[PDB]
C-alpha cells in the first residue's frame, strides 16, 4: 500500500478445478486433471467423504458408468472450434484438439 | 476480516462476492422471482454461510475468503493477506482479479 | 503518531525570524489526504498536503514569526471522504526566534 | 493522451533559464480532479489541478531550472474517490535552458 494503491481491492481469481478420477474401460485410472464431463464430476461429489456424501466405489458399476459417460462424449458438430475465441477460460486445454463434446459443464 | 476491513473502502468494508451467481430456472421459480433472487456480494458479518468452501469443477470465477491478514513489523504499510480459494487439489489457478480488472488483459 | 514540537537550534544560516517546527508520524490509515493542524493564535488552520506516503518518515511544520507564549496545537488527519480523525492536542510554551535578521542600512 | 515533451525555443522574452514544458491530453474519464506527475529529481511531484475540462486542450507544465540529463516522468490521473490511473512513463534527454538570464550590476 502506498501513495497510489491506498485501499485493497476485492481479489477473485479463476480456478481450473479439482482434479477428479477418470474410469477408462480396459481399467487404468486417470486422475491428473479436471475433467468437463458432468458424469465424472457427479462420481467424484458423490465418492467423497471430505464434502458430500461418503458413497463407496464398491456400490458402482463401473462399466455402466463408463459407458454412460461416453453419452455425454459424443462430438457435435454443429460449431466450429475456431468460433471461440476464449477457447483457454471454457474448460478447453488445446485449440488444436476436438474439445466439441454434446455436453460441457464447468 | 476485522484485521482487513481497516485496508478497504467504507463501502465494501465487510462484503465478499457471492460464489455461485446463477443456480438454475426450474418449475419453482417464477422469472421475477428468480432474477431478483440471485446477488452479487454477500455481507460476512452476519452470513455465516459465505464462509463455506466451495468446490469447483473446470474453469470457474470464484471470490475469495480470507483466512489470515497481518502487516509487517517495520513496514507497517506492506501487508500480508491470505485468501482460500476452492477445495481439494485443484489444477491452478488461470488468472487473478485484483480489482474488477484481471492482472492478463482480454 | 508521535505529535511533538522542536525548538529551532542557536545559530544556523537562513531560518531568520523561525520559531520551532512541529513534526508528526502519518497517520496508520492510508487514505488520508492532508493534515489539519490549528494554532491557537491563527484563525485559519495550516493544511499539510500528504503526498508521498512513508510510514516511518516524520512530516513537519514550521513555525515562522509566532511570538512567544501559550500556543495551543490540534492536529488532525482528513480522509477522502471528509472524516476526521480524534484531534491530537499539544501546548508548548513556545520560545523566542533565535535565528535573528540582520541589520539593514 | 498523448504525454510529450517539447522543448522551449532559442530565443523569446521572458522564460529564463525555462526548460521544456510537458504537454498531455486530459483523460477520457470525466470525474479526474488533478494530475500527480512526478519528475525523477524532485523528491515531490507536481500536482496540477484540472479545473476546466476540453478534451482537444492540452495541459502543460513546464520546467524551471532542472540541469540537463537523464529526466523520467510519470504521469497519472487522480479521481475524486482517489483512485489513480495507471501512469504514463516518458524518459527524455531533457536539455539545456537556451533563455538564460542577464548580466547583472
Known amino acids: 500500500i502506498n501513495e497510489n494503491r491506498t485501499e485493497i481491492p476485492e481479489i477473485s481469481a479463476e480456478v481450473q478445478g479439482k482434479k477428479v478420477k477418470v474410469y477408462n474401460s480396459d481399467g487404468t485410472i486417470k486422475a491428473d486433471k479436471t475433467s468437463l464431463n458432468g458424469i465424472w464430476q457427479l462420481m467424484d461429489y458423490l465418492t467423497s467423504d471430505r464434502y458430500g456424501a461418503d458413497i463407496t466405489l464398491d456400490q458402482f458399476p463401473l462399466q455402466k458408468v463408463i459407458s454412460e459417460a461416453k453419452i455425454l462424449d459424443i462430438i457435435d458438430e454443429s460449431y466450429q472450434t475456431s468460433w471461440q475465441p476464449y477457447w483457454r477460460y471454457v474448460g478447453w486445454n488445446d485449440p488444436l484438439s476436438e474439445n466439441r463434446q454434446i455436453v460441457q459443464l464447468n | 476480516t476485522t484485521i482487513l476491513a481497516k485496508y478497504q473502502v467504507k463501502e465494501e468494508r465487510y462484503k465478499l462476492q457471492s460464489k455461485k451467481?446463477?443456480?438454475?430456472?426450474?418449475?419453482?421459480?417464477?422469472?421475477?422471482?428468480?432474477?431478483?433472487?440471485?446477488?452479487?456480494?454477500?455481507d460476512l458479518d452476519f452470513n455465516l454461510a459465505a464462509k463455506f468452501i466451495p468446490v469447483v469443477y473446470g474453469v470457474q470465477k470464484i471470490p475469495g475468503i480470507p483466512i489470515f491478514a497481518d502487516t509487517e513489523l517495520n513496514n507497517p504499510n506492506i501487508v500480508y493477506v491470505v485468501y482460500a480459494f476452492a477445495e481439494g487439489e485443484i489444477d491452478g489457478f488461470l488468472d487473478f482479479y485484483i480489482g474488477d480488472s484481471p492482472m492478463i488483459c482480454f | 503518531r508521535d505529535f511533538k514540537y522542536?525548538?529551532?537550534?542557536?545559530?544556523?544560516?537562513?531560518?531568520?525570524?523561525?520559531?520551532?517546527?512541529?513534526?508528526?508520524?502519518?497517520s496508520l490509515t492510508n487514505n488520508v489526504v492532508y493534515y489539519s493542524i490549528a494554532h491557537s493564535g491563527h484563525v485559519n488552520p495550516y493544511i499539510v498536503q500528504q503526498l508521498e506516503n512513508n510510514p516511518n518518515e516524520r512530516m513537519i511544520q514550521e513555525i515562522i514569526g509566532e511570538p512567544a507564549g501559550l500556543a495551543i496545537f490540534e492536529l488532525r488527519a482528513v480522509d477522502i471522504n471528509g472524516r476526521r480523525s480524534s484531534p491530537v492536542t499539544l501546548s508548548v510554551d513556545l520560545n523566542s526566534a533565535k535565528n535573528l535578521s540582520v541589520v539593514s542600512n
Open chain 2, 21 to 42: 451467481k446463477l443456480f438454475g430456472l426450474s418449475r419453482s421459480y417464477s422469472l421475477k422471482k428468480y432474477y431478483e433472487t440471485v446477488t452479487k456480494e454477500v
Open chain 3, 6 to 26: 522542536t525548538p529551532t537550534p542557536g545559530g544556523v544560516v537562513g531560518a531568520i525570524g523561525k520559531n520551532g517546527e512541529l513534526s508528526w508520524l502519518p
